[PDB]
Amino acid sequence: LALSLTADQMVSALLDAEPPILYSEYDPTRPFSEASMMGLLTNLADRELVHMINWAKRVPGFVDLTLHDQVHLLESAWLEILMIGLVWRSMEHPGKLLFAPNLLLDRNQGKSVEGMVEIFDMLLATSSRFRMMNLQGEEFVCLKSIILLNSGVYTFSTLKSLEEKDHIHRVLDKITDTLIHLMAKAGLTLQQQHQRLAQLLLILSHIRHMSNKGMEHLYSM
Amino acid sequence: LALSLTADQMVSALLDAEPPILYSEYDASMMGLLTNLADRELVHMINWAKRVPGFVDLTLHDQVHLLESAWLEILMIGLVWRSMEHPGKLLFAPNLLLDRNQGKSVEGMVEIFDMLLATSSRFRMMNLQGEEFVCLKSIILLNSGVYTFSTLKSLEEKDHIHRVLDKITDTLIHLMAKAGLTLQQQHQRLAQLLLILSHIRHMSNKGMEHLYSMPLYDLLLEMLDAH
């Protein structure tokens, strides 16, 4: 299956699987009248969640897992995925978070709700780091997919377990390769290739932290 | 400074910097025992941090913010490490080896416990080396609060940290190149190891919510500030 896909096929698939960029729902006319910040953000996240699933299903090696396992991986990584998506489209908007093309917010607008400025600042911080690293879209899609498969993978001791975890680690290893390949093609030396790799995979650690803070908050609202 | 250290010098330093293994004070409260343990370790953690190549070259405020941000992750990867040869148990101390069950003793601890165990297994399953361990522990320190620090001094710092991090990334690969792994095997195990830090982050988060439900920066700074 995915295990036989070539670097260029893996990327290609990943780029194809990309979900559309949704808009924030709201009648522009009248005001901004606090029109519930969470309201707008939550509603946006809900509609994206759907498109996220069809996406997951197209991530090479994902469908080959059991249904219970597909649900546990998504449940475990939906916010991380939503965030890396944000952080990605907010790259060309230093100081702002492009939640939607018609909903670009700034650090300030984040103080509107309690607890949201810290998160906001973290997302911004991350968006900068990606811009500073000149993250490519091919690299992005890879990371997004590594998140899906690596997030809930250590929270799955039956035998069925084993078989599954092996497949996941093989897809992950397959993506790690794809990434290196993307960097080898871009002209980076070997040492440069694994340094950027470590840098990118260490950013996911931050995106994990953000998802955690994002959920405590969600559980507080 | 550290930026000129060779792979073998980096590792060597790291191995030397290793803190001692403390005992649980007792012959009783679970959190009590665990908390008291974590407190005494915290001291030894600082002396350690100070010996991580490139760390002391940062400002005091930055040293305190990195540790404050990664103390629990560090304590945990340490646990997960010594609990490698005790499948099904967490070797908090040599005289305090607990099992999943004893974790149900306190509310909210069994989930944590199961995550720690799950991780401990993954390390055992990967046959993680001690040289690789010390590297990871050090990558945590430097990478944890690095994205929660915009001045100029600020830019100087982040660059140094990303350089030490890159230096360690190298050391790791070197460790794997020496062990016989192919190039592809070298970067795969790298990605696998670095992805486990993401989990160790998640565990530190859960560990703090739990801690929170039952003042450190001033406590760590009182320590880092030596004469």
Ligand SMILES: Oc1ccc([C@@H]2Oc3ccc(O)cc3[C@@H]3CCC[C@@H]32)cc1
């Ligand atoms: O595509 C995306 C990406 C992200 C989001 C919002 O991110 C936040 C950031 C900071 C917050 O205090 C809340 C939120 C919303 C709570 C979960 C996600 C949602 C929507 C849509």
Ligand SMILES: Oc1ccc([C@@H]2Oc3ccc(O)cc3[C@@H]3CCC[C@@H]32)cc1
């Ligand atoms: O070296 C270590 C490493 C780790 C620990 C314990 O980790 C926990 C894990 C899960 C918990 O519900 C509580 C704790 C204790 C509360 C802070 C840390 C302490 C002690 C010593």
